[PDB]
Amino acid sequence: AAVASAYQRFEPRAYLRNNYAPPRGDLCNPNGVGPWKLRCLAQTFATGEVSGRTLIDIGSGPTVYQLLSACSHFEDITMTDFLEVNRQELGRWLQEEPGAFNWSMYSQHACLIEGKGECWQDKERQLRARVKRVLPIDVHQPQPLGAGSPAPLPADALVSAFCLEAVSPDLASFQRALDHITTLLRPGGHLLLIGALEESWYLAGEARLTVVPVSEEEVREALVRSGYKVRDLRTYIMPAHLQTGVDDVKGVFFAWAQKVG
Ligand SMILES: Nc1ncnc2c1ncn2[C@@H]1O[C@H](CSCC[C@H](N)C(=O)O)[C@@H](O)[C@H]1O
Ligand SMILES: O=S(=O)(NCCC(F)(F)F)c1ccc2c(c1)CN[C@@H](CF)C2
Description:
Elements: H1 2-6, H2 12-20, H3 33-46, E1 54-58, E2 76-81, H4 84-94, H5 104-114, H6 120-130, E3 131-136, E4 155-161, H7 164-167, H8 171-182, E5 185-197, E6 201-204, E7 207-210, H9 216-225, E8 228-237, E9 251-259
Parallel strand pairs: 1-2, 1-4, 2-3, 4-5
Antiparallel strand pairs: 5-9, 6-7, 8-9
Helix pairs in contact: 3-5, 5-6, 8-9
The structure holds S-adenosyl-L-homocysteine and the ligand O=S(=O)(NCCC(F)(F)F)c1ccc2c(c1)CN[C@@H](CF)C2.
GO molecular function: phenylethanolamine N-methyltransferase activity
Family: Belongs to the class I-like SAM-binding methyltransferase superfamily. NNMT/PNMT/TEMT family.
EC number: 2.1.1.28
């Protein structure tokens, strides 16, 4: 409830500005964190080993880039978040309403990276078409989505970016939160986890969030303890010019894990 309390001042547009607009949001530099995250996602799905019918995005927040390469492998996509404000923001983009955040640059780069000759409008069209619902969620609950969630369970795959560490006060919480979401994933399923490395706080407007600083090994061990087979775990070290005053993140990790059940 302590963290949950802090997230009450969370400003969606301040978050988007701090992390998805320049300099961090500049996709032109191939050395940026942006191109790196999109490549990890694209390369993974390009292996063709992450497929199914349903997929759930945990703690989607007000962003969609994490689903750009995934949307063409899953016909039923469910997005989620603890904050009403974030679900509202996602709606504005999915419905193409006024003031929606502009993700066209990311769509274009996903198309560029994937290399299938696809135009970005068709990519955004496909994603919007496959996202069937935006549901509330709380990874701190043994049943994240709840009792009678409209989401098809178990899911064939899960995607989660910058959520778990951002909502857990310490390692143990991180672990449980991971066990909580893992129940949502069908045995043999896949989990694509992205997150901040060794970060302790980040700003989102008037909100100042505490973060549990984790390391690559701690993430690996946590995934194993939860019953996953780590297929891939990479690290991106945050360059100096991407070190702004919005947080103290040291790097970013990408984990492709398979629930071995
Ligand atoms: N208990 C909880 N369970 C699930 N999500 C939570 C949560 N508490 C906070 N969150 C959400 O977790 C998000 C962390 S920011 C990450 C946003 C997005 N996934 C990205 O890649 O940028 C926020 O949207 C916040 O509202
Ligand atoms: O800089 S990033 O690695 N990616 C943004 C740049 C982009 F969009 F181009 F990929 C990033 C994204 C989100 C967050 C961070 C970094 C670090 N703070 C967390 C707190 F939860 C949120």
